[PDB]
Amino acid sequence: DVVVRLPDVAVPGEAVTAVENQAVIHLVDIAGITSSSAADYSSKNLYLWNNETCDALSAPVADWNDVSTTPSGSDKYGPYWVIPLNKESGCINVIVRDGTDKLIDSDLRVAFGDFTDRTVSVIAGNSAVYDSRADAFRAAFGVALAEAHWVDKNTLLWPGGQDKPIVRLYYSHSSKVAADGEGKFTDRYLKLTPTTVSQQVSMRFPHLSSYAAFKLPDNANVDELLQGETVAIAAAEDGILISATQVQTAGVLDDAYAEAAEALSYGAQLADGGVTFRVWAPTAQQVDVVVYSADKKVIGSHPMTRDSASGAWSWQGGSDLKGAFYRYAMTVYHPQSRKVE
């Protein structure tokens, strides 16, 4: 079974510096750098155009069918276009294409007051603008963004993994999924197989219905997977990384726990027979009730009981607790910080 690894290529250094009354846009070709073969950048063209917002362009082609705006040169890292300007101030409208097809989903707006050098870099389907080819390359060959969606126990939606030979769900309980000193992805994973978006899923997430669907293995331990980090990885037939992204798990959390979780009561439920503390935290590694005095000194720390069906944590104490102060001490992976908080 193939090991996912980084491409043996040095970090790029622009190759072209933007001069007076002219801008330079670099396409950082991922497919081009993963390949030891030369690339034909003829098909690559920018649909450039002047509007009320971004009008700094000098002579932009009107014809959308005009593929004539081909690269002003290239190298290993990808092509580049030396765009002529009217004014060194303002901004420009760039639509990066391969024929009459958008390479970057969003219409780019290059603000020269945001990139002083006018030497800018972009990656296909990235929407983002980088000041350097390096900054772009690092972003390209890293776990970046949160493109993938674990929408149900079995389904992972990801356009980035569409048509790719290697599609996997890498995971780490206590650490971040990364590349080692050898540039290899050694962390445990699951093999994903192409499938179609479920009728039930399309209803729930109409905004993702067009996204590429992937079936998780049947041996997948959904519960323990949601205990930590998960990363969606797309690689070549040889295992060279194309994309690594973080996973949005709300869909699966509703599909795995919400039915049971919905049938419970939450808070510090003080009733006859005592007080039941219940918090829903289906991803938390640990939850404890910390009970405080009026002076806010710890009076008790009680580890909670996890209900596996719901991912809810509970703890029962005496009616003596009426008026006590408390907080839940969490042990949980936060995808924003990529750490177990």
Q: Which stretch binds other proteins (CB under 8 A): 3-11, 22-30, 245-253, 308-316?
A: 3-11
Closest CB to other proteins among 69 and 269? 69
Q: Is 73 in the site for other proteins (CB under 8 A)?
A: yes
- Identify the burial level of 176 via C-beta atoms within 10 angstroms of its C-beta, where 0-12 means exposed, 13-18 middle and 19 or more buried: middle
Q: Is 338 in the site for other proteins (CB under 8 A)?
A: yes
Which residue in 263, 165, 155 sits closest to 204, CA to CA? 155
The binder of other proteins chosen from 125, 142, 239, 335 (CB under 8 A): 142
List, in sequence order, every residue forming a beta bridge with 316; answer none if it has no partner.
276
The binder of other proteins chosen from 81, 115, 158, 257 (CB under 8 A): 115
Q: Which phi-psi region, left, alpha or beta, contains residue 286 (left: φ > 0; alpha: ψ -120 to 50)?
A: beta
Sequence length of the chain is 341
Could you tell me the smallest distance in angstroms from the CB atom of residue 316 to other proteins?
33
The binder of other proteins chosen from 237, 272, 295, 320 (CB under 8 A): 237
Q: Which residues contact 310 (CB under 8 A, 6 or more apart)?
A: 257, 260, 261, 263, 264, 280, 282
Q: Which single residue is written with the structure tokens 């674990």? A: 150
List, in sequence order, every residue forming a beta bridge with 169; answer none if it has no partner.
232
Secondary structure of 18-43 as H, E, C letters: CCCCEEEEEECCHHHHCCCCCCCCCC
Q: Is 214 in the site for other proteins (CB under 8 A)?
A: no
Q: Which single residue is written with the structure tokens 């690594």? A: 244
Give the H or E element holding residue 260: helix 258-261
Could you tell me the smallest distance in angstroms from the CB atom of residue 62 to other proteins?
20
Copy the structure tokens of residue 84.
């002529």
Q: Is 114 in the site for other proteins (CB under 8 A)?
A: yes
Closest CB to other proteins among 173 and 302? 173
Q: Find out whether 248 and 149 touch, Cβ atoms under 8 Å.
A: yes
Copy the structure tokens of residue 235.
């690689």
Q: Find out whether 267 and 278 touch, Cβ atoms under 8 Å.
A: yes
The binder of other proteins chosen from 51, 70, 106, 210 (CB under 8 A): 70
Closest CB to other proteins among 32 and 317? 32
Q: Is 251 in the site for other proteins (CB under 8 A)?
A: no
The binder of other proteins chosen from 65, 89, 181, 323 (CB under 8 A): 181
Q: Which stretch binds other proteins (CB under 8 A): 5-13, 200-208, 301-309, 320-328?
A: 5-13
Q: Is 89 in the site for other proteins (CB under 8 A)?
A: no
Q: Find out whether 39 and 52 touch, Cβ atoms under 8 Å.
A: no
Copy the structure tokens of residue 102.
């958008």
Copy the structure tokens of residue 168.
């996997």
Strand 312-317 vs strand 274-280: parallel, antiparallel, or unpaired?
A: antiparallel
The binder of other proteins chosen from 84, 99, 165, 300 (CB under 8 A): 165
Could you tell me the smallest distance in angstroms from the CB atom of residue 227 to other proteins?
20
The binder of other proteins chosen from 55, 98, 107, 131 (CB under 8 A): 131
Closest CB to other proteins among 166 and 275? 166
22-51: which residues touch other proteins (CB under 8 A)?
35-41
Q: Is 9 in the site for other proteins (CB under 8 A)?
A: yes
Could you tell me the smallest distance in angstroms from the CB atom of residue 161 to other proteins?
15
List of residues contacting other proteins (CB under 8 A): 7-14, 35-41, 70, 72-74, 76, 113-117, 131, 134, 138, 141-143, 165, 176, 178-181, 183, 237-238, 336-339
